[PDB]
Amino acid sequence: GTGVLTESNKKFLPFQQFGRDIADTTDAVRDPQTLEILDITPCSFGGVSV
Amino acid sequence: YSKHTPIIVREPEDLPQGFSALEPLVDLPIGINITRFQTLLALHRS
């Protein structure tokens, strides 16, 4: 996937790795190496009108 | 799964009415057909 990764203030439990929003999309994932929780925000999109 | 919460008062023996979620402790990857269960208590009667 693609998106901006930011340090999330989510209270991830020690046994939890992934994090989903109201839909089945990974909103946050724990780094497998440094054990850091990062938020997955989508890239900058939007509509265009002429 | 495991969970450890302290009760309020030593009232008559009964499960305290309340919602307490249990977080997983260990996930031992072992396969054995289990049909019976028995606890192990410490005698310590002296």
Curated annotation (Swiss-Prot), chain A:
Attaches the virion to the cell membrane by interacting with host receptor, initiating the infection. The major receptor is host ACE2. When S2/S2' has been cleaved, binding to the receptor triggers direct fusion at the cell membrane. When S2/S2' has not been cleaved, binding to the receptor results in internalization of the virus by endocytosis using host TFRC and GRM2 and leading to fusion of the virion membrane with the host endosomal membrane. Alternatively, may use NRP1/NRP2 and integrin as entry receptors. Changing residue 23 to D: In strain: Alpha/B.1.1.7. It comes from the Viruses. Binds to host ACE2. RBD also interacts with the N-linked glycan on 'Asn-90' of ACE2. Cleavage of S generates a polybasic C-terminal sequence on S1 that binds to host Neuropilin-1 (NRP1) and Neuropilin-2 (NRP2) receptors. Interacts with host integrin alpha-5/beta-1 (ITGA5:ITGB1) and with ACE2 in complex with integrin alpha-5/beta-1 (ITGA5:ITGB1). May interact via cytoplasmic c-terminus with M protein. May interact (via N-terminus) with host bilirubin and biliverdin, thereby preventing antibody binding to the SARS-CoV-2 spike NTD via an allosteric mechanism. The gene is S. This is Spike protein S1.
Swiss-Prot record, chain B:
The chain holds residues 204 to 247 of 1273 of the full protein. This is Spike protein S1. Changing residue 21 to V: In strain: 20A.EU1. Binds to host ACE2. RBD also interacts with the N-linked glycan on 'Asn-90' of ACE2. Cleavage of S generates a polybasic C-terminal sequence on S1 that binds to host Neuropilin-1 (NRP1) and Neuropilin-2 (NRP2) receptors. Interacts with host integrin alpha-5/beta-1 (ITGA5:ITGB1) and with ACE2 in complex with integrin alpha-5/beta-1 (ITGA5:ITGB1). May interact via cytoplasmic c-terminus with M protein. May interact (via N-terminus) with host bilirubin and biliverdin, thereby preventing antibody binding to the SARS-CoV-2 spike NTD via an allosteric mechanism. Glycans are attached at residue 33. Attaches the virion to the cell membrane by interacting with host receptor, initiating the infection. The major receptor is host ACE2. When S2/S2' has been cleaved, binding to the receptor triggers direct fusion at the cell membrane. When S2/S2' has not been cleaved, binding to the receptor results in internalization of the virus by endocytosis using host TFRC and GRM2 and leading to fusion of the virion membrane with the host endosomal membrane. Alternatively, may use NRP1/NRP2 and integrin as entry receptors. Changing residue 9 to G: In strain: Omicron/BA.2, Omicron/BA.2.12.1, Omicron/BA.2.75, Omicron/BA.4, Omicron/BA.5, Omicron/BQ.1.1.
